[PDB]
Amino acid sequence: MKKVIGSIEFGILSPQEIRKMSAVEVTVPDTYDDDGYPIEGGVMDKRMGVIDPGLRCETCGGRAGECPGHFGHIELARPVIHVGFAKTIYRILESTCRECGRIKLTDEEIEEYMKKIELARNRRSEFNEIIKEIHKKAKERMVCPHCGAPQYPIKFEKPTIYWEIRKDEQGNEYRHRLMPTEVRDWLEKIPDKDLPLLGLDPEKSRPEWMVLTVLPVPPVTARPSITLETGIRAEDDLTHKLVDIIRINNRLKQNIEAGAPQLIIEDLWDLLQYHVTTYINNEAPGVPPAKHKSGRPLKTLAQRLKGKEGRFRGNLSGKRVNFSARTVISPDPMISINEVGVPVEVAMELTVPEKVTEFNIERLRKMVLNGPDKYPGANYVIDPEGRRRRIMDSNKETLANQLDIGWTVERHLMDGDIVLFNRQPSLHRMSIMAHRVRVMPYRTFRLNLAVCPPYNADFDGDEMNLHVPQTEEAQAEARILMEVQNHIISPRYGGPIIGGIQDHISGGYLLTREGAYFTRDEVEQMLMFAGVDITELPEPDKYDENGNPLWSGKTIFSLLLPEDLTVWYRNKLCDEPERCEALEKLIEEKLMPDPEEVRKLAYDGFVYIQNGKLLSGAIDKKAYGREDGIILDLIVREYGVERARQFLDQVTKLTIWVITHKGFTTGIDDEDLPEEARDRIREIIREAEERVNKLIEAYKRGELEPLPGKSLEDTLESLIMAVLAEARDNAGAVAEKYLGMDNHTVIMAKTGARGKILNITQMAALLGQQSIRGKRLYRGFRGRVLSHFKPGDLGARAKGFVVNSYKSGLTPQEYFFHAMGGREGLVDTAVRTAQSGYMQRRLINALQDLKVEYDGTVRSPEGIIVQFKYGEDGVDPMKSWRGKTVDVDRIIVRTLLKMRG
Amino acid sequence: THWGRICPTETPEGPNCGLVKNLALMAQITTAVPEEEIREYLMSLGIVPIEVRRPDPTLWRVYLNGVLIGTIEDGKALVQRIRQDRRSGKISDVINVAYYED
Amino acid sequence: ERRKDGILYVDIPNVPKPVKFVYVMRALGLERDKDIVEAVGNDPEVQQIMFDNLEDASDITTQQEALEFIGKLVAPGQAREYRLKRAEYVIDNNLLPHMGVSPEDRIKKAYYLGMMALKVIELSLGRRPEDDKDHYANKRLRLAGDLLKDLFRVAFSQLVKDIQYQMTKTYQRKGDKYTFGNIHRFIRNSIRPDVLTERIEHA
Ligand SMILES: [Mg+2]
Ligand SMILES: [Zn+2]
Ligand SMILES: [Zn+2]
């Protein structure tokens, strides 16, 4: 019984429609009356609808607040030109014969233009161009091809005055004003077949209807009297304009019926036209804006729509939606990735409506007995009829014994309910996801750490919002479409986006590091902590000196992987490619070598898993990191989403336990270098400075070759920058060479958990050149940056090259240069946000309508076909492996291993 | 040129970055001395006013608070004399003098 | 400004449109072409540049009619005296007002215009570089003292206007015998300090 508007076609109303659609013929300019009652025949009649309280509508019989209002019409004495259609009318007049009214065009031209219009229907711009071309062609013509009668030029005077420049018997050109009746007579004779070329539809917009003969009156609800603080019924501007229209119409009619002279009839006609134009649009060009009773321009129909806060552009907005909360977030890895911790106070306010049935009557009875204070309680109960009551304490004991099927209880949030989670600014799709509630004390939205990357959140004061869907359909949509599990693989690049970040990588490396063994106590404790379901330990690997059994980390990790997973790849720790070559040789030769042989050839740079057993390699970013998560991707794409969630939720806790109870830290001595490395760095710096000075001298004495792209100075600057960058790279290479892998900072950098090699270089060896907008520092005094350098100096030290690392400490000039660099970085960060936001807004406004049809095609909102078989292959980027439609190599290897095993 | 006058680090983050600054600890902001006393001083130093002569390629142009007031020769000697008088206590410390050889 | 053709122009804030440079110098009483050239320097290329500029002026205005032309730009009042007064007003109170507003100050403003034109010419020829707008030699700080000075100036102007209006109204509604009978109370009873107090406070 409830249908959905499938389309809206716009047209021009006909006078007959306005007459029959309307109910009351407004004739008397009557206001609200002294007693605030609707006067008969007034602007606010009772057939128009009632907004005043305590009376019934005449037409529908509805009380104020339930009567939608009804339309009325005004019978104009003389035709009036609509302001909006004035330009269209003028264009039409220049294209049709004065006598026949047909289009002044040859039949062949008509056929050609009709074909072109049929082809370019959809494209609005091309349609307008064709219309303008036809208008120009017709207007340029002088003799009607059908009648041969002359067509005196028509001149348009803004806003609604038309002049026909006619030639007298003496040849003088005089302007003859076209009265609206003449325009109507001209427009009526235009046949239907000529309308499509003229830019019209002969079923919804006829040219005769552009000139108004009947003016509809909006209902009282559309023009309500907002009243005033004093009680004065502050009227609507539309009401005042309608009153003036009625007065002028009656005056014009009575003078017409009294045989008045033509001049006064013309005066009243023009007054009516001006009033109508200012009522439709009070800001129409060439129209004096009508003043309110206070002397301000009246807001009219045009102004009521073209407002940023009006119906257009105003309904779309962001306001305080119901059932929402906002607070800071704190981390906790003890909950599953698809769970969120909610404070008790929030849970006691964001109620969710639940209808009581046979299988949940007792739970709701207990909840309503708890009242609105105990946590598992309710705040409102709705009877089957529809009244709402607050539980409180007076009637807490009742409303439970009288609660049966058909009631509705607004219980508090409980564990398992579905809830959305948002972080602003919301950039991509993953910024809103659905979580499961887990009510815990204190006041913070607890969030699992593996879910941080998609949200792009850090626990340094960031705030998040959650919304609680109310209806069952919304809850089902959130649960099935929006859960965190389904969004492991990012739609952008087809790889994972949920995975370990900082400890989940470093601790994994510590666990799987070569030569790492654990005692029985640690093994049992970490397995129980991770939640892994086990009941007997595997066979010990290697015995302690005093006789205690030991277990290598690789087997413990292998206890998590599925029973038939098999994969091999090269991680980021590969520094001796020969060993990787040997392992690849063996694996490719056999496809299933005996695990004993692999043990002798094991190397932590080459991960190899056979039937769920980790035989070689170590865990790093490429295992289950933010991107390139080979193992996590394999689990997602081969064992289903639930298995992937379980694997992530176990490996996270296991790695956290091992890093917590194994010890991980960093001190000031993590970037202490031996004396030889310091001497090497010092001599590198000195040599680079010497070369720079040599370049400067060569430039000074005219010995320089300017490449075509640059002048002498620009070439000099390019050479200097290249030399300094190469020197910094050499120093970094030396520092990296002398820093061992056992160093914790080096571990963090190499595994990719956090930081880059450049950070170690800057902190230990050398900071390097400082630049602004890709150029050497130059903005300062005349010829020098600081005041402590000789003017006209281009040496490396004097233009932003700093030679002290963070450990050694910066001299004041170096400190100032570093400040310049940091300020530039901050400014760039500040501006790029706005620029990217603008670009994204443009792209979304352009592309947010495209969708995949049921036949695989992608169609524009106006019906144009944009793409057959979306993506030219039909593969969702999420489902794609890494861009490839099907990774047939993995398929071949996996099937061969499964069936040959 | 912000060295010693504007703190190079303390600045808000966001739209106001760089546009809002804080004075350095050694910074000192000056007030104004009566300008006609200073003008009388430079005139006594021997700068012939612009009404009696015109700028020439071999003449130095003297500006006071940005307005040309006369011409002189050997501007270096003039600025040396003014500085010596400033640190001899003859005139106030508000006066600052610089010359451009270019 | 120096256009791409080499012809100089001056942009007065009140005058809606730029004026040619030699016209402006002649309006300030500097009429001699030799003196106009001398006021900007003696470098021969600069001399030739201004020879071209005065040739562009074509001696259309030599002593007068420059003020009349300016009056043509600045809302001509259709009267010789009206155009003359408008031209001299915008000349005195909008061409370097820091040099003074008396008609005598025009001859002094001529030299400043000349040195500005010399700066523009030197920049055109590359003899001097651009001026760095961020250099603190070119920046000043508006302290609390001068801001208070400006606010107090505005408030005091308002108070003076109110004083004049109140004095005029009281005289016209009471007659001569009261005003000059005892001027002290007459002056004292027209102050209305609340205008000043509320203006400064709300600012
Ligand atoms: Mg943050
Ligand atoms: Zn009704
Ligand atoms: Zn015809």
Length of chain C: 203
Report DSSP state, residue A99.
Answer: S
Q: Do B8 and A826 touch (CB under 8 A)?
A: no
Bridge pairing between strands A408-411 and A432-440? unpaired
A580 is in an annotated binding site: no
Report DSSP state, residue C115.
Answer: H
Find out whether A24 and A47 touch, Cβ atoms under 8 Å: yes
The residue among A21, A200, A162 whose CA lies nearest residue A79 is A162
Identity of the residue in B3, B8, B18 whose CB atom sits nearest the CB atom of A827: B18
The answer to whether B63 faces chain A, any CB pair under 8 Å, is no
Report DSSP state, residue C13.
Answer: S
Phi and psi at C64, nearest 5°, equal -135, -170
Q: How far apart are CA B42 and CA A241, in angstroms?
A: 75
A332 is in an annotated binding site: no
Identity of the residue in C42, C98, C111 whose CB atom sits nearest the CB atom of B57: C42
Determine the residue among C108, C121, C132 to mutate to test chain B binding: the one whose Cβ has the most chain B Cβ atoms within 10 Å. C108
Identity of the residue in B1, B5, B68 whose CB atom sits nearest the CB atom of C115: B68
Range list of H helices, A664-711? 675-700
Residues in chain A within 8 Å Cβ distance of B3:
786-787, 816
Determine the residue among B39, B54, B58, B63 to mutate to test chain C binding: the one whose Cβ has the most chain C Cβ atoms within 10 Å. B54
The residue among A812, A774, A780 whose CA lies nearest residue A793 is A780
Question: Hey, which chains touch A, using 3+ CB pairs under 8 Å?
Answer: B
Q: How far apart are CA A432 and CA A447, in angstroms?
A: 14
- Min Cα separation B56/chain C (Å): 7
Residues in chain A within 8 Å Cβ distance of B9:
819
Distances (CA, A) of A710 to A693, A713, A714, A718, A775: 20, 8, 5, 9, 14
Token output for B37: 């006393």
Looking at the CA of A46, which ligand is closest? Answer: 2
CA of A627 to the centre of ligand 1 (A): 21
Contacts of A65 (CB under 8 A, 6+ apart): none
Find out whether A764 and A736 touch, Cβ atoms under 8 Å: no
- Give every strand in the sheet of B67-72, ordered side by side: B48-49, B67-72, B60-64
Q: How far apart are CA A94 and CA A86, in angstroms?
A: 13
What is the maximum span of chain C, computed from C-alpha positions, in angstroms? 74
Q: Which residues pair with A103 in a beta bridge?
A: A96
Q: How far apart are CA A612 and CA A567, in angstroms?
A: 9
Contacts of C158 (CB under 8 A, 6+ apart): C195, C196, C199
CA of B35 to the centre of ligand 3 (A): 87
Residues 761-780 of A with CB under 8 A from B: 780
Report the chain A residue with the minimal C-alpha distance to residue B8.
Answer: A819
A574 is in an annotated binding site: no
The answer to whether B17 faces chain A, any CB pair under 8 Å, is yes
Looking at the CA of A145, which ligand is closest? Answer: 3
Phi and psi at A483, nearest 5°, equal -75, 155
Contacts of A289 (CB under 8 A, 6+ apart): A278, A282, A283, A297, A298
Identity of the residue in B5, B61, B102 whose CB atom sits nearest the CB atom of C136: B5
Torsion over CA: A835, A838, A841, A842 (sign)? negative
* CA A732 to chain centroid: 41
CA of A60 to the centre of ligand 2 (A): 4
Q: How far apart are CA C134 and CA A778, in angstroms?
A: 13
Contacts of A608 (CB under 8 A, 6+ apart): A567, A568, A583, A587, A598, A614, A615, A616, A617
The residue among B99, B93, B83 whose CA lies nearest residue B30 is B93
The residue among A812, A805, A828, A816 whose CA lies nearest residue A779 is A816
Residues in chain B within 8 Å Cβ distance of A826:
13, 17-18
Find out whether A202 and A192 touch, Cβ atoms under 8 Å: yes
Q: Do B13 and A781 touch (CB under 8 A)?
A: no
- Min Cα separation A778/chain B (Å): 11
Total CB pairs under 8 A between chain B and C: 27
Looking at the CA of A67, which ligand is closest? Answer: 2
Token output for A702: 């005219």
For chain A, report the end-to-end CA distance as a whole number of angstroms: 62
Q: How far apart are CA A52 and CA A67, in angstroms?
A: 11
Three-state secondary-structure class, residue A170:
coil
Token output for A269: 């006609």
Q: Do B15 and A816 touch (CB under 8 A)?
A: no
Bridge pairing between strands A324-331 and A445-447? parallel
Report the chain B residue with the minimal C-alpha distance to residue A834.
Answer: B15
Range list of H helices, C58-104? 66-73, 80-94
Find out whether A664 and A744 touch, Cβ atoms under 8 Å: yes
Q: How far apart are CA A825 and CA A313, in angstroms?
A: 37
Find out whether B45 and B73 touch, Cβ atoms under 8 Å: no
CA of A68 to the centre of ligand 2 (A): 6
For C76, counting Cβ atoms within 10 Å of its Cβ (0-12 exposed, 13-18 middle, 19+ buried), the class is middle
Please give all residues whose CB falls under 5 A of ion ligand 2, grouped by chain where several chains appear: A 49, 57, 59-60, 62, 67
Looking at the CA of A49, which ligand is closest? Answer: 2
Find out whether A792 and A713 touch, Cβ atoms under 8 Å: no
Token output for C166: 């109140």
Token output for A416: 């398992």
Q: How far apart are CA A721 and CA A699, in angstroms?
A: 15
Q: How far apart are CA A407 and CA A723, in angstroms?
A: 80
Distances (CA, A) of A880 to A430, A489, A876, A888, B95: 18, 10, 6, 12, 75
**What is the Cα gyration radius of chain B?**
18
Phi and psi at A339, nearest 5°, equal -130, 155
A462 is in an annotated binding site: yes
Inter-residue long-range contacts of A228-233, CB under 8 Å, 24+ positions, other chains counted: A233/A31, A233/A32, A233/A36
**Which H or E run contains A763?**
helix A757-764
Amino acid (one-letter) located at A131: I
Q: How far apart are CA A168 and CA B6, in angstroms?
A: 82
Q: Which residues of A792-815 are buried (b: 16+ CB within 10 A; e: fewer)?
A: eebebbbbbbbbebeeeebeebbe
Report DSSP state, residue A773.
Answer: T
Find out whether C135 and B1 touch, Cβ atoms under 8 Å: yes
Please give all residues whose CB falls under 5 A of ion ligand 3, grouped by chain where several chains appear: A 97, 99-100, 144, 146-147
Residues in chain A within 8 Å Cβ distance of B14:
830
Looking at the CA of A151, which ligand is closest? Answer: 3
What's the reported resolution, in angstroms, to a tenth? 3.2
The residue among A887, A837, A846, A890 whose CA lies nearest residue A866 is A846
Where do we find the tokens 């030029």? A153
Distances (CA, A) of A594 to A515, A590, A598, A900: 21, 9, 7, 14
The answer to whether C152 faces chain B, any CB pair under 8 Å, is no
Find out whether A44 and A38 touch, Cβ atoms under 8 Å: yes
Length of chain B: 102
Find out whether A472 and A352 touch, Cβ atoms under 8 Å: no
Torsion over CA: A187, A193, A199, A203 (sign)? positive
Q: How far apart are CA A621 and CA A627, in angstroms?
A: 8
**Which H or E run contains A771?**
strand A771-772
Q: How far apart are CA A510 and CA A661, in angstroms?
A: 11
Identity of the residue in C41, C111, C136 whose CB atom sits nearest the CB atom of B50: C111
Token output for A847: 């592309």
For residues A282, A288, A289 and A292, what is the CA-based torsion angle, rounded to 10 degrees? Answer: -130
CA of A182 to the centre of ligand 3 (A): 16
The answer to whether B101 faces chain A, any CB pair under 8 Å, is no
Residues in chain C within 8 Å Cβ distance of B49:
none
Experimentally determined by:
cryo-EM
* CA A348 to chain centroid: 31
Where do we find the tokens 């993995």? A890
Token output for A690: 């010497």
Q: Do A826 and B13 touch (CB under 8 A)?
A: yes
Q: Do B29 and C141 touch (CB under 8 A)?
A: yes
